[PDB]
Structure 1
Amino acid sequence: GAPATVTEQGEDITSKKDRGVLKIVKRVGNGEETPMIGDKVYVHYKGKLSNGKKFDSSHDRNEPFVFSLGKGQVIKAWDIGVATMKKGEIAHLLIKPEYAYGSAGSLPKIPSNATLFFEIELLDFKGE
C-alpha cells in the first residue's frame, strides 16, 4: 500500500542521495514558501513502524503537533521532509533508521534499526 508506493515512486530528498528519506506529495499545497529553519511549524500526522506493530497519530491527542524546524525537536527526517512542504500539503515519507532512531532505537516504543512511515499534513508555519 502507501509505504510500498513510496519505495516505488518516492523522491529521494536526502542531500547524500542514500534513499534515507523518500517522499510522495499526496495532496498539493499552495504558496511558493516552504518552512525555513527556525520556523514554528504546525502539522497533523499519522505514523507507524514498518514492522506493523505501532501506530501513532496527532489526532489521538485531538490537537496539532507543533515543533520548531531544524531546532532539534524531531527526527532528522522530519527536519528534512517538512522543509520541503507547502502550506496545506499532505505528503508520505518513508524513513530508514539513520534518519530516525538509528541502531540504538528508542526502546521500547521504537526498536533498533527501525524503518518508519508517516503521512504529514502541513497546516501552518510562522516565523520565529
Structure 2
Amino acid sequence: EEDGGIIRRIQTRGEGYAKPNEGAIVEVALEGYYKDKLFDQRELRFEIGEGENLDLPYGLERAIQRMEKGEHSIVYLKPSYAFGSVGKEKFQIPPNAELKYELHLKSFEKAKESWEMNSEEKLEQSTIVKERGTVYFKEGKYKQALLQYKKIVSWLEYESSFSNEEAQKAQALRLASHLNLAMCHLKLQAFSAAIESCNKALELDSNNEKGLSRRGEAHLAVNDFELARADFQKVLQLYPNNKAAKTQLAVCQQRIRRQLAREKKLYANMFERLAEEENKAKA
C-alpha cells in the first residue's frame, strides 16, 4: 500500500477500541529524531489534518490515525512520508531524510463524519467550525483557518433535505464561508484564489459589499485595474458611503491614467519608427 513508508513499533498498547480519524482533536506527546539526534519534542493538542502547520510530517499524522488512547509507539517514516524533498530547515533536516518519532497518544475525540451528520447537525458542526476558523483567523494562523471554513462549503453542498428554513441558514453559512475564505486568501496573498471565493460568494448574494470589495481588492492587488475599477465602481453604486471603494477607485484611475500615457507614447514611437523604415524602403 504505502509500501513500508510509515513503519510503527508499538511500545505500550493502548486499552481502547477507538482510533483517531481525520479531523479528530488529539493530545500527543512527541519526540522527533534525525539520526538519533533529537530535533522535535513537545506535547500538543492539534487537529488531525493540520499538522503541516505545526511542523509535523504527514506520515506522522497518518500514523496517529492507527493508535489508541494512552499508547506509546515509535514511528519510522521514510523521506517520502517525512519532510521529503524540502526537509525542514528550522530542524536542520535536509532533503530526502528518514525520521524516527516517539509519540504517545494521550487522548482524542473522533470527529463526526459528514454522513453521520443529520440535517440540523450539519448546520451545527458548520457554525462550530466557522468560529473555530475565525479564531484561527484572528491569531493570524490563516492557513489553519482555511481548513475550517472549507469544511463548511463541503458539508452543506449535497445535503438538500433542508426545511426551507434550514435552507436559509445553510445558504448564509455558505455565503459566510466564502467571504471568509476570500479574507484568508487575501491575507495569504493568494489573489487568484481570493477571486474564486469572491465569485462563489457573489453567486449567493450578487450585491454583497464584502465580496465585491475584496474581489475588487484582489484584482487591484494583481494590477488588473480595469476589472478592479469595475468592482469598486459597483460597490459605490450599491454602497456610496464606502471608504475603501472611493479610495481604491482613485488608485485605479491614477494607474489606468498612467498606463494609457505609457502605451500611447509607445504606439506613437512605434508608428514613427515604422514610417522611418518605410521611407528608406524607397530605393
Aligned counterparts of 2:39 and 2:60: Cα–Cα separation in 1: 17
Match of residue 82 from structure 2? 100
Superposition map of 1:35-54 within 5 A: 35-50=20-35, 52-54=36-38
How much has 1:31 moved relative to structure 2? 1.2
CA deviation after TM superposition for structure 1 residue 72, in Å:
4.9
Which residue identity lines up with residue 17 of structure 2 in the other structure?
E
- Per-residue CA distance 1:8-30 (angstroms, 9 max, x = gap): xxxxxxxx242111011100111
Partner of 1:118: 101
Task: Give the total of aligned pairs.
Answer: 107
CA distance in 1: counterparts of 2:96 and 2:66, whole angstroms: 25
Shift of 1:71: 3.6
In structure 1, which of residues 84, 91, 96 is the aligned counterpart of residue 66 of structure 2?
84
The corresponding residue for 1:32 is 17
TM-score normalised to structure 1 length: 0.75
Aligned to 1:6: none
Instruction: Give the TM-score, by structure 2 length.
Output: 0.36
Change (3 A) 1:102 1:127: same
Shift of 1:55: 3.1
For structure 1, the 5+ residue unaligned runs are: 1-15, 59-63
2:40 alignment partner in structure 1: 56
Identity %: 32
Distance change in 2, residues 1:32/1:127 (3 Å): closer
Alpha carbon RMSD of aligned pairs, Å? 1.7
**Inter-partner Cα distance in structure 2 for 1:39 and 1:29:** 17
The structure richer in helix per residue is 2
Work out whether residues 20 and 99 of structure 1, in 8 Å CA contact, stay in contact via their aligned partners in 2: yes
CA contact (8 A) 2:60 2:77 kept: no
- Mapped to 1, the partners of 2:3 and 2:49 lie a distance apart of 20
Deviations 1:53-105 (A, max 9, x none): 443321xxxxx212211245332211210000000000110111110111121
Larger relative CO (CA 8 A, sep 6+): 1 or 2? 1
| Partner Cα distance (1:17, 1:99) in 2 | 9
Q: Which runs of 5+ in 2 are unaligned?
A: 112-283
Q: Distance in 2 between matches of 1:88 and 1:32?
A: 12
Displacement over 2 Å in runs of 4+: 52-56, 70-74
State the Cα distance separating 1:110 from its structure 2 match.
1.4
Corresponding residue number in structure 1 for 2:46? 67
